[PDB]
Subunit: 138 residues, 4 copies
């Protein structure tokens, strides 16, 4: 039901990494990735982009050459997602702020101008027959 | 009166957390939380995501290993609540962009057109009576 | 001409503070605030919130208990300002791909509506006054 | 064809700035910019605004005091590129959310309307035919 459908997606990605992270790194880098719990904190820190490279990544990468893949990808994917959650919320927000409240009126104020054009049609009708009973009663 | 309603909600949070902040940490991190004033600053520094974990929190969490709840919550609560302000500004923004004007310029373009359908209408009734009478007068 | 009104504000706020701190601080922290061009950079990293407090502002605050004002003022100010270039460009963007084209397509679908409406008006006058004549002979 | 147009500029801006940087900074800062990969990673780092001044730029400026040009230009270019991609996504986001329909639901509503106005242009012409024959059949 909306943003919440990627709010969950974020949560999935995050966990999956926090596990991947505990699974490769927990050994040599336990302050960061020893427990699953460990890795989550460390990830949410990486997410905030607070000291991610110089603090967490770079030191981990000198332990494992390939390890950038894991940090870079996480940051990429994770940010792409957080970006959407944000736009999604923007949208959803002004969708209330304005478009709900207005698509309401542009419909209803145009209901009136339907009825108005109707009344006039019925009038033109009734008249159009009065005039053609003069053309009969003659 | 609008967003400044939510900018209150923020100043409240900040206070709740700087008090819970000094009441909690000033013995051990006197530099960061040693006073109320002090504890604000650090909360603003943390709020800006500047060194929040490696610099302030992770030293603190050595001290009280539960205090991540203090920091994580405060980043979420604090961040979510700033996002409402960045939204409601994007909004009050577009009010004055567009909505205000195009919104009153569609009330009006309707009025002029409604008033036209009303004149349009009068004459139809008018015509009717003229016909009504031509009809009676010669039955 | 619009967005680049705040852009000029931003650059000016910059100058006031660059000067401000090259005066305030230049003697005591000459590596950051020594020269004006010095402070221009320093206030740039700060604008990007990079190590502003742990590596710059806290260092200076120990010198000058009050300088905190200087930093937190700037962050606050130079943010709202940038936020408005984002907002400025966002709006003037949407205006560009959508609003412009619609505020005018709907102005024009109403010209047409009016004109059709106008024609119906003359048709009723002539009709109203055919009947006028016709009733006076009768 | 839209965004991944932009998302290639970003891609190329990176490429350029990464060679320029390896050529410029390899011998002096070999961990950061020693090879080309080095310098890409190091840029992604700088791009995320992570530590980019205290940990990278400022030490480099120590060695090449003009180097700030490299880093400040890079931040600006890359982050403005990034802003477009964001904006262009937020727009095509709004298009699909809303403008797609409100701009084609109004096409339809004012279709319907022209139809009714045309309906009665009809009977008002018809009734001018009647009242017309009324005058001739005198
Ligand atoms: Br009408």
């Amino acid at each position: 039901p909306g943003i919440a459908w990627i709010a969950l997606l974020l949560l999935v990605i995050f966990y999956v990494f926090a596990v991947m992270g505990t699974k490769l790194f927990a050994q040599s880098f336990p302050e960061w990735f020893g427990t699953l719990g460990a890795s989550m904190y460390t990830l949410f820190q990486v997410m905030t982009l607070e000291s991610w490279s110089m603090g967490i990544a770079r030191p981990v990468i000198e332990a494992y050459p390939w390890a950038w893949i894991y940090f870079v990808s996480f940051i990429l994917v994770s940010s792409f997602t957080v970006l959407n959650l944000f736009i999604g919320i923007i949208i959803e927000s002004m969708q209330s702020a304005h478009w709900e409240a207005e698509d309401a009126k542009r419909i209803e104020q145009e209901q009136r101008a339907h009825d108005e054009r109707l009344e006039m049609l019925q009038l033109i009708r009734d008249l159009s027959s009065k005039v053609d009973r003069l053309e009969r009663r003659s």
